[PDB]
């Protein structure tokens, strides 16, 4: 025999592993790296854990959050990772919302997760006694409803209470203090009330471009099929775009065979994708009117549930919405209480119902864009689900799908009327948005909706009269397909806009999908967006034809010497260009030498940044020589670029000639007193440079003096930064007294 603890441990592992294992398929063969990032390197799943003991994982519908927990569970239940926890308790929030009956923690862990065969009482005790060896996971937290009578304290494990009260208290640390928790949610339902008690907060972006490649390889084993899909994607920017989000990579893979036939051109918008998967399911049975009433019966349930904030259905609810076995087999319902294959499929079918059902009055649709029980359901529906439904609604009414839908109607009269109502709401939508700004996730969904409807004139109308100068979309979850929408709408602006896209997941594919609106930008900010030389070399060939575009910022991407020649062409040819930021990439001396040629033949540039790169002495020469004669550049960072005294000589020689450079940043090289001395020689023939940052540079009092001697005859400099250098406390005292401008 063994005790009741070791017995439960082993039951739990069995049951968890048994559920975690499968998605005929095997999660362990199929799971594919899905990047995990923080604040608010970049860490893998295995690094998930490293006061307040609850970790949060947040990402858009379909970014792989459910599947991430599922792998955590599998990895634990089989020994491979996360072995510090003796017990792991998987929960699904959409299933807990369905429990009215108040609950104790016991009845939770045991009735609603895993029943111990023996020792119930003794086991629970062990858990209470050793909480630091417990993990609880809660999937899809957004699918709870937290109310005004669920905030009370409650520390009793044995005392019944409501379901949500348990969670609230679990997370604070009132129940199972020091036990770990992991939550997955959409970005909306994370308020700062919760956020107080979160260890760390991760963000789940989706597959990188080589993720997708991997994924496809893992799923398709047939000889070189993965290759031929990776070909399809590499010839089809839009489809490739969508696949950065695994639910699309899944769909693509799921329809490989019909995608590879085509014959009739690939899909482009998200609605196209959801239509393609629909017809796939319908081939296991026009084709669509064949199963029309089925889809309507499902859509009705979808909208119902959506309006009700119920994403799981009891066979009583299923009979009450008249869904027979023949309906269920079509395969949108799954997993016996049933749920929709994915939340997005609920939203698609709801949108479908909304288009075609003859119980949906035109005016009800006005609620999808914020402008019948149908109407009432829409008002009660969660915003992040309405945003999605409405995007699909837009798509289904596109001109491309006139015909599909004209099959199912006896009378297009109805469709004409809904199209026109949607179109009306959409045209108003962007004014409605900016005029009530007392936001910017709401903005993209409006963009996505205009893009899906696919009418060009409609984008134009929606944008007419707006006065946008700056458009901040940082940390907004912008991928390759958000980029496609953004382009679709923004290209129509007549005011050059500053497109601030810092900290997203644009990548090379997003850059390509942005290009049509590049003409409408005066400034493109794409820091921390995982862009390679392929992306930037493309971006430049197009930038050369946009005279409006003057600033480009590409800090912290994967650029390398391979982009050098393109950069040389940019500086040499665009001649109203103002600002270029390339900090934190992998440019080296050779790239620097190469691109500098373009600098020599440049007239207009004003800022040029290289912080974090490694141009070194030969790269610092080549830039210095280029900038000696250069008439407009006023700022230059070579911070952290491994520049010895050889490059500092060259930069000095530059200052004897250059008459325009005002600031020159050098912190974090290895300059030594040698370099500072020639730099100081330079200052004695420069009546123009204002600031000279020289922090963290192995400079000794010897150097400081050469600078001070030069500062004797030079009055134009305002500051010379030296902090962090090897100065003795007694040496520092002296330097304060000796000249005011030396910032220590
Ligand atoms: N890391 C992954 N590896 C392989 N497939 C994934 C991964 N993440 C998501 N998927 C695919 O996407 C589908 C839906 O993803 P899901 O985990 O439900 O995202 P979310 O729960 O955030 O909406 C999965 O059933 C699976 O096909």
XYZ file of C-alpha atoms and ligand atoms in Angstrom:
771
model
C 0.000 0.000 0.000
C 0.824 3.695 -0.076
C -0.585 6.710 1.809
C -3.502 8.781 0.451
C -1.121 11.526 -0.675
C 1.252 9.483 -2.859
C -1.931 7.842 -4.199
C -3.536 11.120 -5.265
C -0.262 12.471 -6.655
C -0.206 9.490 -8.978
C -3.908 9.636 -9.893
C -3.559 13.330 -10.709
C -0.517 12.784 -12.923
C -2.465 10.037 -14.716
C -5.624 12.051 -15.227
C -3.810 15.287 -16.179
C -1.366 13.625 -18.585
C -4.326 11.699 -19.984
C -6.210 14.966 -20.761
C -3.057 17.018 -21.699
C -1.774 14.409 -24.150
C -4.127 14.795 -27.092
C -5.499 17.680 -29.192
C -4.498 10.389 -33.746
C -2.438 13.552 -32.931
C 0.026 14.211 -30.080
C 0.549 17.577 -28.372
C 4.186 16.603 -27.664
C 5.040 16.191 -31.372
C 2.953 19.266 -32.322
C 3.619 21.978 -29.720
C 5.770 24.676 -31.266
C 7.736 27.445 -29.611
C 5.475 30.398 -28.928
C 7.544 33.357 -27.670
C 6.821 34.666 -24.145
C 7.631 38.361 -23.207
C 7.361 40.722 -20.227
C 7.562 44.538 -19.419
C 5.372 46.558 -18.956
C 16.401 38.302 -24.398
C 12.851 36.887 -24.531
C 12.007 33.751 -22.489
C 10.884 30.210 -23.437
C 8.029 28.253 -21.804
C 10.414 26.237 -19.656
C 11.448 29.548 -17.976
C 7.879 30.312 -16.923
C 8.393 30.633 -13.161
C 11.964 31.801 -12.338
C 5.246 37.995 -2.454
C 2.113 37.602 -4.624
C 2.273 34.139 -6.174
C 0.102 34.379 -9.330
C 1.627 34.514 -12.874
C -0.390 35.975 -15.722
C -0.243 35.085 -19.431
C -2.017 37.464 -21.760
C -2.634 37.475 -25.472
C -5.255 37.823 -28.163
C -7.902 35.276 -28.997
C -6.056 32.478 -30.795
C -2.514 33.334 -29.666
C -2.125 29.888 -28.067
C -2.868 30.594 -24.396
C -5.073 27.469 -23.870
C -2.526 25.353 -25.608
C 0.226 26.821 -23.499
C -1.324 25.695 -20.217
C -2.033 22.384 -21.869
C 1.690 21.924 -22.499
C 2.578 23.025 -18.946
C 0.217 20.316 -17.668
C 1.599 17.678 -20.014
C 5.194 18.571 -19.131
C 4.478 18.341 -15.410
C 2.346 15.200 -15.486
C 5.097 13.308 -17.310
C 8.134 14.358 -15.293
C 9.874 16.515 -17.935
C 9.482 20.009 -16.455
C 7.897 21.840 -13.490
C 8.700 19.017 -11.082
C 8.879 21.320 -8.041
C 5.072 21.005 -7.803
C 3.605 17.857 -6.240
C 0.077 18.721 -7.376
C -1.141 20.679 -10.395
C -4.813 21.621 -10.622
C -6.123 22.508 -14.080
C -9.314 24.597 -14.217
C -11.364 26.056 -17.076
C -13.063 29.369 -16.111
C -15.807 28.978 -18.708
C -16.829 25.794 -16.818
C -16.640 27.343 -13.387
C -18.938 30.237 -14.358
C -21.513 27.466 -14.848
C -21.429 26.450 -11.162
C -24.066 28.247 -9.062
C -24.000 25.911 -6.020
C -21.642 27.656 -3.574
C -18.307 25.885 -2.997
C -15.574 25.237 -0.493
C -11.990 24.895 -1.726
C -12.335 21.149 -1.003
C -15.406 20.628 -3.133
C -13.546 22.645 -5.859
C -10.286 20.678 -6.026
C -12.054 17.315 -5.524
C -15.529 17.346 -7.155
C -14.549 19.808 -9.938
C -11.028 18.606 -10.884
C -9.945 15.256 -9.373
C -11.547 12.886 -6.834
C -9.014 11.072 -4.599
C -9.952 7.376 -4.402
C -9.212 7.229 -0.612
C -8.342 9.561 2.296
C -10.243 12.622 1.005
C -10.027 14.225 4.431
C -6.363 13.376 5.057
C -5.321 14.480 1.559
C -6.931 17.939 1.682
C -5.066 18.388 4.950
C -1.720 17.724 3.279
C -2.542 20.354 0.632
C -3.355 22.966 3.260
C -0.169 21.983 5.073
C 2.101 22.156 2.004
C 0.665 24.796 -0.344
C 4.115 25.780 -1.765
C 4.060 22.441 -3.656
C 0.749 23.246 -5.419
C 0.006 24.907 -8.757
C -3.417 25.996 -9.977
C -4.040 27.007 -13.568
C -7.043 29.034 -14.666
C -7.738 29.176 -18.372
C -9.617 32.006 -19.982
C -10.141 34.224 -16.956
C -11.887 36.796 -19.142
C -14.776 34.302 -19.303
C -15.702 34.899 -15.660
C -18.079 37.571 -14.379
C -16.857 39.322 -11.232
C -19.662 41.220 -9.425
C -20.289 43.794 -6.617
C -20.959 41.015 -4.016
C -17.809 38.868 -4.650
C -15.056 41.199 -3.179
C -15.407 40.130 0.491
C -12.596 38.403 2.404
C -12.925 34.643 3.063
C -10.074 32.507 4.486
C -11.891 29.251 5.257
C -11.053 26.278 3.015
C -14.038 24.295 4.355
C -16.664 27.122 4.250
C -18.876 27.212 1.177
C -19.168 30.509 -0.776
C -19.522 31.516 -4.442
C -17.078 30.391 -7.102
C -15.702 33.824 -7.904
C -15.180 34.648 -4.224
C -12.863 31.646 -4.078
C -10.735 32.974 -6.896
C -10.619 36.567 -5.706
C -9.344 35.184 -2.378
C -7.037 32.544 -3.896
C -5.157 35.272 -5.777
C -4.785 37.682 -2.887
C -3.093 34.888 -0.875
C -5.991 34.421 1.572
C -6.514 30.812 0.418
C -3.576 28.488 -0.150
C -0.999 31.243 0.673
C 2.292 30.613 -1.218
C 0.706 28.161 -3.707
C 1.436 29.139 -7.294
C -1.217 30.139 -9.788
C -1.126 30.728 -13.522
C -3.819 32.704 -15.308
C -4.407 33.099 -19.022
C -6.616 35.956 -20.224
C -7.427 38.301 -23.109
C -5.987 41.782 -22.531
C -9.348 43.389 -21.631
C -10.215 41.535 -18.411
C -6.835 42.346 -16.757
C -7.701 45.341 -14.534
C -5.232 46.749 -11.949
C -7.476 45.391 -9.103
C -6.188 41.911 -10.023
C -2.740 43.164 -11.166
C -1.776 44.208 -7.621
C -1.286 40.535 -6.775
C 0.676 39.230 -9.808
C 4.235 37.947 -9.557
C 4.933 38.716 -13.217
C 2.835 39.253 -16.365
C 3.758 37.605 -19.610
C 2.544 38.420 -23.117
C 1.962 35.752 -25.725
C 2.472 37.139 -29.202
C 2.291 34.182 -31.566
C 4.650 32.291 -33.843
C 7.642 33.978 -35.358
C 8.212 33.371 -39.036
C 10.358 30.285 -38.252
C 7.862 29.138 -35.693
C 5.398 28.816 -38.564
C 7.969 26.948 -40.559
C 8.518 24.543 -37.682
C 4.835 24.074 -36.923
C 4.081 23.145 -40.540
C 7.017 20.734 -40.569
C 5.764 18.989 -37.421
C 2.207 18.597 -38.738
C 2.976 17.469 -42.280
C 5.138 14.391 -42.609
C 4.234 13.424 -46.171
C 7.347 13.995 -48.272
C 8.091 17.733 -48.831
C 4.568 19.036 -48.200
C 5.700 21.331 -45.445
C 8.037 22.780 -48.139
C 5.250 23.359 -50.593
C 3.086 25.115 -47.945
C 6.017 27.237 -46.877
C 6.210 28.078 -50.549
C 2.562 29.041 -50.739
C 3.057 31.330 -47.745
C 6.240 32.844 -49.086
C 4.347 33.718 -52.276
C 1.286 35.113 -50.444
C 2.072 37.857 -47.981
C -1.479 38.037 -46.520
C -1.927 34.347 -45.824
C 1.569 34.249 -44.298
C 0.598 37.280 -42.289
C -2.307 35.508 -40.606
C -0.309 32.406 -39.726
C 1.743 34.337 -37.177
C -1.263 33.593 -34.981
C -1.397 29.875 -34.358
C -5.119 29.465 -34.851
C -4.475 30.491 -38.468
C -1.408 28.291 -38.848
C -3.734 25.550 -37.655
C -6.416 26.461 -40.215
C -3.896 26.676 -43.012
C -2.454 23.284 -42.122
C -5.978 21.959 -41.653
C -6.874 23.010 -45.234
C -3.484 22.260 -46.843
C -5.003 20.178 -49.637
C -7.487 22.733 -51.010
C -4.980 25.577 -50.557
C -2.469 23.693 -52.693
C -4.972 22.903 -55.444
C -5.759 26.631 -56.133
C -6.838 27.347 -58.842
C -8.890 30.379 -57.806
C -6.451 32.472 -55.695
C -5.722 32.147 -51.951
C -7.570 33.804 -49.026
C -6.512 37.185 -47.708
C -8.754 38.476 -44.899
C -9.601 36.669 -41.651
C -13.176 36.237 -42.802
C -11.791 34.493 -45.952
C -9.987 32.041 -43.646
C -13.057 31.340 -41.608
C -15.021 30.747 -44.769
C -12.398 28.323 -46.061
C -12.507 26.269 -42.905
C -16.320 26.339 -43.075
C -16.359 24.819 -46.559
C -13.780 22.273 -45.388
C -16.143 21.091 -42.674
C -18.997 21.109 -45.188
C -17.149 18.686 -47.491
C -17.596 16.099 -44.720
C -21.360 15.830 -45.511
C -24.173 25.301 -53.783
C -22.817 23.230 -50.934
C -23.580 25.670 -48.148
C -27.325 26.133 -48.553
C -27.335 22.324 -48.292
C -26.587 22.700 -44.551
C -27.939 26.226 -44.077
C -30.472 25.654 -41.299
C -27.848 23.765 -39.293
C -25.493 26.780 -39.393
C -28.310 29.152 -38.452
C -29.279 26.921 -35.532
C -25.626 27.006 -34.457
C -25.219 30.736 -35.073
C -28.292 31.377 -32.961
C -26.806 29.411 -30.114
C -23.521 31.276 -30.722
C -25.133 34.711 -30.515
C -27.257 33.569 -27.582
C -24.230 32.389 -25.636
C -22.175 35.375 -26.704
C -24.866 37.747 -25.419
C -25.199 35.661 -22.299
C -21.467 35.383 -21.631
C -21.858 31.600 -21.702
C -19.337 29.649 -23.757
C -20.265 26.112 -22.554
C -23.602 24.355 -23.125
C -25.633 21.756 -21.163
C -27.569 19.240 -23.307
C -30.687 20.949 -21.988
C -29.509 24.263 -23.474
C -28.597 22.362 -26.684
C -32.083 20.807 -27.036
C -33.642 24.175 -26.064
C -31.787 25.768 -29.004
C -32.821 22.788 -31.182
C -29.384 21.410 -32.179
C -29.749 17.775 -33.252
C -26.886 15.195 -33.474
C -26.704 15.823 -37.236
C -25.870 19.493 -36.514
C -23.242 18.661 -33.872
C -21.326 16.270 -36.152
C -20.514 19.108 -38.572
C -17.841 19.809 -35.994
C -18.030 23.341 -34.662
C -19.203 21.942 -31.330
C -16.859 19.772 -29.257
C -15.501 18.242 -26.076
C -20.952 15.674 -22.043
C -21.278 19.507 -21.942
C -20.317 21.057 -25.337
C -18.416 24.210 -26.258
C -17.473 25.970 -29.522
C -14.326 24.782 -31.280
C -12.780 28.155 -30.418
C -14.237 31.400 -29.069
C -13.620 32.889 -32.554
C -15.932 30.294 -34.120
C -18.663 31.355 -31.775
C -18.138 34.911 -33.029
C -18.067 33.828 -36.675
C -21.340 31.902 -36.476
C -22.963 34.666 -34.481
C -21.933 36.981 -37.354
C -23.286 34.442 -39.828
C -26.603 34.277 -38.033
C -26.665 38.043 -37.906
C -26.240 38.223 -41.700
C -28.708 35.581 -42.864
C -31.281 34.757 -40.155
C -34.598 36.414 -40.930
C -35.251 37.226 -37.239
C -32.499 39.840 -37.198
C -33.854 43.325 -37.765
C -31.534 45.623 -39.731
C -31.333 48.103 -36.858
C -30.076 45.539 -34.334
C -26.786 45.503 -36.280
C -26.222 49.113 -35.262
C -25.121 47.739 -31.855
C -22.190 45.790 -33.290
C -20.385 49.094 -33.908
C -21.871 50.989 -30.921
C -24.588 52.987 -32.731
C -35.326 42.589 -30.389
C -33.752 40.139 -27.911
C -31.133 40.099 -30.721
C -30.393 43.769 -29.982
C -30.460 43.062 -26.210
C -28.055 40.151 -26.511
C -25.640 42.376 -28.437
C -25.658 45.037 -25.694
C -24.904 42.448 -22.950
C -22.176 40.733 -25.078
C -18.590 41.256 -24.046
C -16.800 44.021 -26.023
C -13.790 41.922 -27.090
C -16.333 39.424 -28.551
C -18.449 42.090 -30.180
C -15.318 43.590 -31.757
C -14.667 40.162 -33.367
C -18.219 39.399 -34.398
C -18.476 42.775 -36.086
C -15.249 42.255 -38.016
C -16.703 39.044 -39.389
C -20.007 40.723 -40.112
C -18.119 43.286 -42.178
C -16.310 40.545 -44.075
C -19.384 38.472 -44.914
C -20.954 41.580 -46.510
C -17.844 42.243 -48.663
C -18.445 42.291 -52.404
C -16.266 39.208 -52.795
C -18.997 37.257 -50.916
C -22.073 38.764 -52.625
C -22.675 35.506 -54.402
C -22.059 33.049 -51.588
C -24.766 34.773 -49.617
C -27.133 35.437 -52.557
C -27.452 31.625 -52.842
C -29.045 31.324 -49.330
C -31.419 34.298 -49.592
C -34.572 33.979 -51.717
C -34.426 37.809 -51.607
C -31.214 39.906 -51.643
C -33.413 42.771 -50.390
C -32.411 41.644 -46.873
C -28.699 41.535 -47.595
C -28.806 44.929 -49.361
C -30.345 46.368 -46.225
C -27.810 44.922 -43.813
C -24.832 45.761 -46.006
C -26.053 49.356 -46.221
C -26.557 49.597 -42.468
C -23.163 48.123 -41.713
C -21.571 50.378 -44.297
C -23.219 53.378 -42.701
C -21.990 52.453 -39.209
C -18.499 51.830 -40.521
C -18.210 55.126 -42.388
C -19.047 57.052 -39.197
C -16.870 54.800 -37.088
C -13.538 56.663 -37.027
C -15.009 60.089 -36.341
C -17.128 58.523 -33.621
C -13.911 57.199 -32.130
C -11.611 60.218 -32.063
C -14.374 62.669 -31.136
C -15.104 60.721 -27.895
C -11.519 60.799 -26.433
C -11.809 62.276 -22.858
C -9.141 53.506 -26.904
C -6.349 52.333 -29.217
C -7.244 48.579 -29.092
C -10.760 49.769 -30.034
C -9.095 51.667 -32.851
C -7.591 48.580 -34.545
C -10.854 46.640 -34.443
C -12.446 49.514 -36.301
C -9.553 49.323 -38.725
C -9.940 45.530 -38.974
C -13.641 45.991 -39.733
C -13.001 48.416 -42.622
C -10.349 46.096 -43.978
C -12.710 43.060 -43.828
C -15.603 44.778 -45.579
C -12.972 45.249 -48.315
C -14.548 48.240 -50.022
C -11.900 50.805 -50.892
C -14.166 53.864 -51.171
C -15.379 53.075 -47.664
C -11.937 53.530 -46.112
C -11.632 56.815 -47.936
C -14.954 58.113 -46.561
C -14.244 57.023 -43.026
C -10.988 58.870 -42.998
C -12.226 62.071 -44.653
C -12.301 65.007 -42.227
C -10.042 63.406 -39.631
C -7.022 65.340 -38.472
C -4.513 62.791 -37.197
C -0.894 63.832 -36.819
C 0.373 61.225 -34.392
C -0.930 57.686 -34.134
C 0.361 55.816 -31.082
C -0.042 52.051 -31.317
C 2.696 50.736 -29.029
C 2.120 47.472 -27.101
C -1.098 47.105 -29.083
C -0.516 43.559 -30.395
C 0.156 44.522 -33.989
C 1.000 41.657 -36.271
C 1.324 41.133 -40.012
C -2.457 41.223 -40.468
C -3.090 44.270 -38.336
C -0.529 45.784 -40.677
C -2.573 44.761 -43.663
C -5.631 46.507 -42.232
C -3.696 49.573 -41.143
C -2.306 49.967 -44.645
C -5.776 49.517 -46.133
C -7.164 52.501 -44.280
C -4.185 54.762 -43.609
C -3.015 55.061 -47.197
C -6.010 57.357 -47.764
C -4.852 60.076 -45.304
C -3.806 63.420 -46.845
C -2.052 64.566 -43.731
C 1.295 62.885 -43.232
C 0.999 60.922 -40.014
C 3.580 59.773 -37.446
C 3.013 56.006 -37.201
C 4.280 54.891 -33.832
C 4.381 51.094 -33.866
C 7.154 50.487 -31.273
C 6.895 47.178 -29.311
C 4.696 44.934 -31.421
C 5.273 41.904 -33.624
C 5.379 43.380 -37.111
C 8.348 41.384 -38.457
C 9.409 41.323 -42.094
C 5.893 40.215 -43.153
C 4.175 43.092 -41.392
C 6.564 45.546 -43.008
C 5.606 44.247 -46.390
C 1.907 44.551 -45.615
C 2.417 48.141 -44.376
C 3.972 49.451 -47.580
C 0.855 50.774 -49.274
C 0.342 53.430 -46.593
C 4.039 54.301 -46.254
C 3.391 57.188 -48.601
C 1.055 58.642 -45.977
C 3.742 58.646 -43.209
C 6.080 61.445 -42.185
C 7.565 59.085 -39.544
C 7.629 55.366 -39.006
C 8.614 54.057 -35.545
C 9.172 50.257 -35.508
C 11.385 49.611 -32.479
C 11.268 46.149 -30.879
C 9.415 44.547 -33.792
C 11.583 41.601 -34.775
C 12.534 42.940 -38.250
C 15.383 41.463 -40.301
C 17.456 42.765 -43.169
C 14.837 41.302 -45.589
C 12.210 43.557 -44.069
C 14.241 46.735 -43.860
C 15.694 46.340 -47.422
C 12.164 46.160 -48.730
C 11.000 49.067 -46.611
C 13.742 51.283 -48.045
C 13.167 50.497 -51.731
C 9.673 51.833 -51.095
C 10.719 54.734 -48.809
C 12.655 56.240 -51.710
C 9.323 57.001 -53.439
C 7.660 58.573 -50.381
C 8.982 62.117 -50.130
C 6.699 62.695 -47.153
C 8.669 60.154 -45.065
C 11.512 61.737 -43.107
C 12.133 59.685 -39.914
C 12.728 55.971 -39.534
C 13.379 54.321 -36.163
C 14.424 50.675 -35.992
C 15.925 50.321 -32.530
C 16.273 46.762 -31.270
C 15.598 44.491 -34.232
C 17.699 41.875 -36.073
C 19.389 44.136 -38.576
C 22.919 43.352 -39.660
C 25.602 44.328 -42.132
C 23.326 42.883 -44.838
C 21.084 45.914 -44.652
C 24.148 48.215 -45.096
C 23.950 48.900 -48.820
C 20.221 49.691 -48.684
C 20.923 52.155 -45.861
C 23.662 53.669 -48.034
C 21.041 54.119 -50.804
C 18.618 55.718 -48.422
C 21.028 58.409 -47.123
C 22.402 59.021 -50.577
C 19.055 59.331 -52.408
C 16.132 60.496 -50.234
C 17.091 64.093 -49.661
C 14.615 65.399 -47.205
C 15.480 62.654 -44.780
C 15.868 63.719 -41.140
C 16.249 60.921 -38.571
C 17.548 57.361 -38.633
C 17.719 55.120 -35.570
C 19.498 51.788 -35.774
C 20.481 51.160 -32.152
C 20.596 47.567 -30.874
C 21.120 45.572 -33.993
C 24.151 43.647 -35.229
C 25.862 46.224 -37.351
C 29.625 45.921 -37.218
C 32.518 47.904 -38.655
C 31.929 46.530 -42.145
C 28.275 47.567 -42.289
C 29.334 50.948 -40.922
C 32.006 51.363 -43.582
C 29.495 50.438 -46.262
C 26.582 52.640 -45.277
C 28.790 55.642 -44.534
C 29.340 56.194 -48.242
C 25.701 57.260 -48.440
C 26.259 59.648 -45.552
C 29.020 61.355 -47.473
C 26.553 62.122 -50.314
C 23.817 63.272 -47.929
C 22.647 66.816 -47.259
C 19.598 66.730 -44.983
C 20.055 64.253 -42.151
C 19.909 65.552 -38.608
C 19.874 62.556 -36.263
C 21.720 59.291 -36.680
C 21.803 56.651 -33.913
C 23.882 53.501 -33.487
C 23.655 52.788 -29.755
C 24.297 49.151 -29.022
C 25.792 48.246 -32.401
C 29.546 47.528 -32.752
C 30.979 49.772 -35.481
C 34.338 49.920 -33.661
C 37.382 51.868 -34.840
C 37.151 51.229 -38.608
C 33.423 51.872 -38.639
C 33.861 54.949 -36.478
C 36.542 56.188 -38.888
C 34.327 55.770 -41.942
C 31.424 57.625 -40.364
C 33.680 60.385 -39.015
C 35.241 60.979 -42.426
C 31.794 61.034 -44.000
C 30.495 63.540 -41.466
C 33.505 65.891 -41.578
C 32.014 67.949 -44.408
C 28.355 67.102 -43.564
C 26.273 70.235 -43.251
C 23.079 69.242 -41.348
C 23.729 66.425 -38.863
C 23.399 67.645 -35.285
C 23.204 64.418 -33.232
C 25.070 61.151 -33.364
C 25.110 58.269 -30.864
C 27.934 55.751 -30.983
C 27.178 54.673 -27.426
C 28.318 51.126 -26.634
C 30.063 50.520 -29.941
C 33.467 49.177 -28.887
C 35.474 52.161 -30.038
C 39.128 52.400 -29.048
C 41.434 55.393 -29.389
C 41.871 54.854 -33.149
C 38.256 55.766 -33.849
C 38.458 58.584 -31.309
C 41.330 60.085 -33.260
C 39.137 59.932 -36.401
C 36.158 61.460 -34.616
C 38.420 64.225 -33.352
C 39.761 64.952 -36.812
C 36.061 65.204 -37.801
C 35.466 67.969 -35.199
C 38.276 70.116 -36.624
C 36.145 70.387 -39.804
C 32.487 69.687 -38.891
C 30.577 72.909 -38.197
C 27.043 71.513 -37.647
C 27.265 68.658 -35.113
C 25.867 69.838 -31.807
C 25.768 66.680 -29.669
C 28.011 63.574 -29.806
C 27.293 60.610 -27.555
C 30.087 58.171 -26.643
C 29.238 56.615 -23.273
C 30.154 52.931 -22.820
C 33.086 52.506 -25.182
C 36.667 51.944 -24.157
C 38.220 55.330 -25.065
C 41.047 55.679 -22.507
C 42.993 58.917 -21.841
C 44.715 58.574 -25.212
C 41.425 59.073 -27.145
C 40.157 61.886 -24.963
C 43.415 63.790 -25.580
C 42.983 63.904 -29.370
C 39.292 64.534 -28.812
C 40.372 67.524 -26.749
C 42.757 68.592 -29.533
C 39.712 68.542 -31.781
C 37.671 70.780 -29.465
C 40.335 73.453 -29.892
C 39.334 73.883 -33.542
C 35.581 73.434 -33.118
C 33.323 76.432 -32.422
C 30.046 74.468 -32.891
C 29.671 71.276 -30.839
C 27.595 71.836 -27.734
C 27.371 68.531 -25.832
C 29.944 65.691 -25.642
C 28.898 62.635 -23.672
C 31.916 60.570 -22.522
C 30.631 58.447 -19.596
C 31.859 54.884 -18.737
C 35.099 55.107 -20.733
C 38.199 54.229 -18.610
C 39.201 57.880 -18.385
C 41.668 58.978 -15.727
C 42.439 62.415 -14.287
C 45.098 62.674 -17.050
C 42.278 62.747 -19.624
C 40.022 65.053 -17.625
C 42.870 67.581 -17.632
C 43.331 67.482 -21.435
C 39.593 68.174 -21.678
C 39.869 71.033 -19.145
C 42.890 72.511 -20.946
C 40.871 72.518 -24.160
C 37.858 73.972 -22.323
C 40.142 76.909 -21.383
C 40.181 78.202 -24.998
C 36.704 76.861 -25.995
C 33.561 78.621 -24.805
C 30.943 77.080 -27.198
C 30.668 73.644 -25.455
C 27.924 73.452 -22.818
C 28.480 69.983 -21.302
C 31.010 67.142 -21.155
C 29.661 64.093 -19.351
C 32.206 61.969 -17.425
C 30.293 60.066 -14.724
C 31.209 56.432 -14.100
C 34.866 56.880 -15.106
C 37.777 55.724 -12.862
C 38.223 58.826 -10.763
C 39.366 58.683 -7.117
C 37.019 60.349 -4.652
C 39.814 62.911 -4.102
C 40.153 63.482 -7.882
C 36.369 64.102 -8.167
C 36.392 66.800 -5.485
C 39.026 68.662 -7.530
C 37.106 68.519 -10.819
C 33.926 70.154 -9.487
C 36.002 73.226 -8.531
C 37.980 73.366 -11.755
C 35.159 73.889 -14.354
C 31.385 73.973 -14.069
C 30.614 72.226 -17.385
C 32.153 68.834 -16.449
C 29.075 66.762 -15.515
C 30.202 64.061 -13.037
N 2.150 26.514 -29.225
C 1.392 25.910 -30.160
N 1.819 24.878 -30.926
C 0.988 24.335 -31.836
N -0.287 24.751 -32.050
C -0.800 25.766 -31.331
C 0.028 26.411 -30.317
N -0.693 27.375 -29.741
C -1.914 27.348 -30.360
N -1.962 26.387 -31.294
C -3.064 26.070 -32.204
O -4.076 27.071 -32.177
C -5.303 26.515 -31.751
C -5.994 27.506 -30.831
O -5.064 28.110 -29.924
P -5.503 28.435 -28.409
O -4.509 27.741 -27.523
O -6.974 28.154 -28.172
O -5.278 30.023 -28.275
P -6.080 30.883 -27.164
O -6.432 29.860 -26.123
O -5.097 31.913 -26.687
O -7.261 31.491 -27.882
C -4.896 25.230 -31.056
O -5.943 24.264 -31.004
C -3.713 24.769 -31.876
O -4.026 24.241 -33.165
